[PDB]
Amino acid sequence: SAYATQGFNLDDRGRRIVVDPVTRIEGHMRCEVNVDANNVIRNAVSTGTMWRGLEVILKGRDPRDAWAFVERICGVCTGCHALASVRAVENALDIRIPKNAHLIREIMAKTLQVHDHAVHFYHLHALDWVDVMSALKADPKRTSELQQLVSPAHPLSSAGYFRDIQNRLKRFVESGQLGPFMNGYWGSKAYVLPPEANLMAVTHYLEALDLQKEWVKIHTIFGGKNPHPNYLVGGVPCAINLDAASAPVNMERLSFVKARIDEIIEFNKNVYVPDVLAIGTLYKQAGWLYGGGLAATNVLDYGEYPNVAYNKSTDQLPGGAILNGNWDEVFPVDPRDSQQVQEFVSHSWYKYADESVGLHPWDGVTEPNYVLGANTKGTRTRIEQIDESAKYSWIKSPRWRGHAMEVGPLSRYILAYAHARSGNKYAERPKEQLEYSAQMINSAIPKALGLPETQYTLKQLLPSTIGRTLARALESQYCGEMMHSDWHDLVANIRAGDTATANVDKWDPATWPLQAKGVGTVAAPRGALGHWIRIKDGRIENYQCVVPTTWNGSPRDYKGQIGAFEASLMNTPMVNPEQPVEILRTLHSFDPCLACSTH
Amino acid sequence: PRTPVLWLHGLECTCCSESFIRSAHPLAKDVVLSMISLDYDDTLMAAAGHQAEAILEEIMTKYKGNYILAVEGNPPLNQDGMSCIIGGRPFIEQLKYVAKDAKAIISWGSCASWGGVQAAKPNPTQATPVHKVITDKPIIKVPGCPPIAEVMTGVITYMLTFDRIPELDRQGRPKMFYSQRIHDKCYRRPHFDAGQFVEEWDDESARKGFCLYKMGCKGPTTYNACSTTRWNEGTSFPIQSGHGCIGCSEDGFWDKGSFYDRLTGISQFG
Numbered sequence A: 001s002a003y004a005t006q007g008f009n010l011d012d013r014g015r016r017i018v019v020d021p022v023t024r025i026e027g028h029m030r031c032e033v034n035v036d037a038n039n040v041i042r043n044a045v046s047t048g049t050m051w052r053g054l055e056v057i058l059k060g061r062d063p064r065d066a067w068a069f070v071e072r073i074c075g076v077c078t079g080c081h082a083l084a085s086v087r088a089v090e091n092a093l094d095i096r097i098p099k100n101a102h103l104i105r106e107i108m109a110k111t112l113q114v115h116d117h118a119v120h121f122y123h124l125h126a127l128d129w130v131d132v133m134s135a136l137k138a139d140p141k142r143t144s145e146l147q148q149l150v151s152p153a154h155p156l157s158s159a160g161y162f163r164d165i166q167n168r169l170k171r172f173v174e175s176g177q178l179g180p181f182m183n184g185y186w187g188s189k190a191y192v193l194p195p196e197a198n199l200m201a202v203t204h205y206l207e208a209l210d211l212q213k214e215w216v217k218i219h220t221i222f223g224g225k226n227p228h229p230n231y232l233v234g235g236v237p238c239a240i241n242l243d244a245a246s247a248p249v250n251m252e253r254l255s256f257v258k259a260r261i262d263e264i265i266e267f268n269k270n271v272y273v274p275d276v277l278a279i280g281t282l283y284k285q286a287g288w289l290y291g292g293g294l295a296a297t298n299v300l301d302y303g304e305y306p307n308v309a310y311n312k313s314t315d316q317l318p319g320g321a322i323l324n325g326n327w328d329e330v331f332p333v334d335p336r337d338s339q340q341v342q343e344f345v346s347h348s349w350y351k352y353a354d355e356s357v358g359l360h361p362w363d364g365v366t367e368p369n370y371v372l373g374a375n376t377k378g379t380r381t382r383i384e385q386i387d388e389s390a391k392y393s394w395i396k397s398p399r400w401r402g403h404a405m406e407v408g409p410l411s412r413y414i415l416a417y418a419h420a421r422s423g424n425k426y427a428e429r430p431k432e433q434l435e436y437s438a439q440m441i442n443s444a445i446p447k448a449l450g451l452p453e454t455q456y457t458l459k460q461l462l463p464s465t466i467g468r469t470l471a472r473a474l475e476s477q478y479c480g481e482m483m484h485s486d487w488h489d490l491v492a493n494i495r496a497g498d499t500a501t502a503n504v505d506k507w508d509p510a511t512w513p514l515q516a517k518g519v520g521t522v523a524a525p526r527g528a529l530g531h532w533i534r535i536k537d538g539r540i541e542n543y544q545c546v547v548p549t550t551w552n553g554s555p556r557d558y559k560g561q562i563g564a565f566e567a568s569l570m571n572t573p574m575v576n577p578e579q580p581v582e583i584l585r586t587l588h589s590f591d592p593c594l595a596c597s598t599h
Numbered sequence B: 001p002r003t004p005v006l007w008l009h010g011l012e013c014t015c016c017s018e019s020f021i022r023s024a025h026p027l028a029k030d031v032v033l034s035m036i037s038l039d040y041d042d043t044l045m046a047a048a049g050h051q052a053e054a055i056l057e058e059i060m061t062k063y064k065g066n067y068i069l070a071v072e073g074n075p076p077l078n079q080d081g082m083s084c085i086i087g088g089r090p091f092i093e094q095l096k097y098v099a100k101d102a103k104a105i106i107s108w109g110s111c112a113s114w115g116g117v118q119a120a121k122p123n124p125t126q127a128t129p130v131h132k133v134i135t136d137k138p139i140i141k142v143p144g145c146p147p148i149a150e151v152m153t154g155v156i157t158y159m160l161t162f163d164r165i166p167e168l169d170r171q172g173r174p175k176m177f178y179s180q181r182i183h184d185k186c187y188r189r190p191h192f193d194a195g196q197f198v199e200e201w202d203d204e205s206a207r208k209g210f211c212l213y214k215m216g217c218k219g220p221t222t223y224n225a226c227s228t229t230r231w232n233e234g235t236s237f238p239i240q241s242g243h244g245c246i247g248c249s250e251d252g253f254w255d256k257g258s259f260y261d262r263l264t265g266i267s268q269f270g
């Protein structure tokens, strides 16, 4: 029925709306909401609709093989699970990897961040902000003028170029076979962009689709292939030789990588960040500041990208936890502490001995229990309306010291901003990006477009669907900049005479302690990722993953506290409750990865 | 008219959809806009919920027996099929519905083809490959985790140009892409033939690109185009970047022992 939690007044008496499948995500999700007399969402229900059981499958296998299994949790955030796995095994066995392996892993991680973020925004998210049919009405000359205002440095800006792109779209649509645009919500009043902005965005959608395949060639060089590049416990397999054409890594290969990094930097600076700033400005002007959810109070990240390896104080995206919207106090987060990260299954399709408690992942349990509540409409194999008072999702409910947290690029940027305000110098660049962005959104872009200047603070702008989308773009840019530096450090280290790529001292399990436990954490594209392993007599005894979309998409916990997705949808008006435009726009701002969330 | 493709997703990691968009020849953009009509695909489609599901019925009616069903991932038989739920119903019911009127069925990747990672022991969801569920339709398997991008678009291109499934081997794989073992043309073969092997990671042999057989390379028993076509516009492949093949295009590769355990009987592969 109705109850209050975390400042939200949940009420399920209104009209029930079902969105199944939620499309333009990775994997499978069902979303249900209730709307009031004025089409405002007053209840939201997040249902993960898939499970594979990787945690169960890993039992008894060799820890050195684990990375390849868990990599297949997700082909979108491809490699982040492999990284978490090798880190967890290295932690369990006290293995320190050499400098070149560290830098190569960081470059692969930051390449994934950029590819994942840019593809998400253009190919999954943009159609929630952009009306492709409106782009057909655009004047190519005014689109060229907009492009030159939005991003002066982007060379692809002529009226003729935009006309050609428009004409291809026109012919595609006029064929009667609309493909990915079929049955879309085009013409909804939820869309506010002018035709020229729509054409600009669709043009960049097509540019990004062609360019994204180039960026991943960095993974291919270091890891053999993309998706699913290879990793290694103890280092990297891509051995180095300069003097050499039959080594995985030589100077020509490194020069190739640098050429790709430079292309990435240009795309982020000239295409991606400016588009998000421009679209964000126009939706801000429309007053669409919904979707803040838990970002306004509680955010978490483990912290990542130490500029000195194994020295967490040097994290370039410094982490921790913020509670109650107090940005003056960042709490330290310890993934080894049994009282911090815990998972509940009270409203999930699993079972524990006692479901009134949350388990730390070293003590985690994954036993499936697909059962539906008494208030379900439909049957076990034909659900009409899911019963959120009972078990309603394949996603577990992770909490931090019992608190529900939002994770992701937005969480990392709020944390970075908080750290920077307390004197942390490693967070200077994200702070600079945020201040630059607020000035662009409030003053510069409005002035260029003849719109009124606004005075929103970062504390006001960031906790919103617009802010969540912005943070992703800024993070992409920051990651591109960081791996540019990593490349220089890698080459410098190799030229100084250190060619080491793997520590094999503890490769053989005859060298291992007879039991051990370890944890590996990663700032994955969607937020805080952790793998927790227990090893016994050379084998995996327990392996538990808590993944970013597990946090964000989580169902309610034992106390009935809602997770980030459900909180973000609350109190959002819908133009038409039968067209899920606003639901998709906000859910997509989290970049939901459902295969990840359930594993 | 461009041939409709209804691209379904079961239990999956989405690696096959991702690999598909890496294609350089042809570009995925050109495939979507000019070659096929990608009418259903949960990863890219504008419509959601009821609007998305309504597309299936429309296309199946208007193009009966003249659309391609592409399947990424697979259906689970445990949990009453509800370890993969679409539109409140088991995925298997969607798969069977769309398969009935398809001209051809493509099983993308190792999941759809053979079971994939979720089917590795003890297979908690009883994940089952497409050809064990759909037993009365022509199916082409395009295995690999994921398959090479140009192999995926190569299969589509052939099917669209000729309105035919290409010649298949006994396991249902296209001979034009899966006739060779990795080991047949692997550029490290001269080292294998001379008994020159990597024995520990980053040893002197590894820096010289010696054969990876003794580090567990499953290239000698794995059929794919990786050693010739290679990955991401011919940039590299697992072995060129220094890791042995783990056998990812082969049936049950997840349960063939540790990836780092060498194959026995080395003289078989000489």
Ligand code: NFU
Binding pocket: A026, A073, A074, A075, A076, A077, A078, A080, A081, A524, A525, A526, A527, A529, A547, A548, A549, A550, A592, A593, A595, A596, A597
């Ligand atoms: N980013 C990301 Fe994955 Ni497909 C999620 N959620 C995870 O680690």
Ligand code: SF4
Binding pocket: B182, B183, B184, B186, B187, B188, B189, B190, B192, B210, B211, B212, B213, B217, B218, B219, B220, B239, B244, B245
């Ligand atoms: S065993 Fe592997 S690395 Fe060696 S020649 Fe064969 S395929 Fe190549």
Ligand code: F3S
Binding pocket: A225, B144, B145, B182, B222, B223, B224, B226, B237, B238, B239, B244, B245, B246, B247, B248, B249
């Ligand atoms: S692991 Fe797979 S990608 Fe090719 S080299 Fe082996 S078949």
Ligand SMILES: [Cl-]
Binding pocket: A120, A121, A125, A469, A472, A588, A589
């Ligand atoms: Cl986005």
Ligand SMILES: [Cl-]
Binding pocket: A370, A371, A372, A373, A380
């Ligand atoms: Cl039930």
Ligand SMILES: [Cl-]
Binding pocket: B110, B111, B114, B115, B116, B117, B119, B250, B251, B252, B253, B254
């Ligand atoms: Cl398999």
Ligand SMILES: [Mg+2]
Binding pocket: A055, A396, A544, A545, A546, A547, A599
């Ligand atoms: Mg888990």
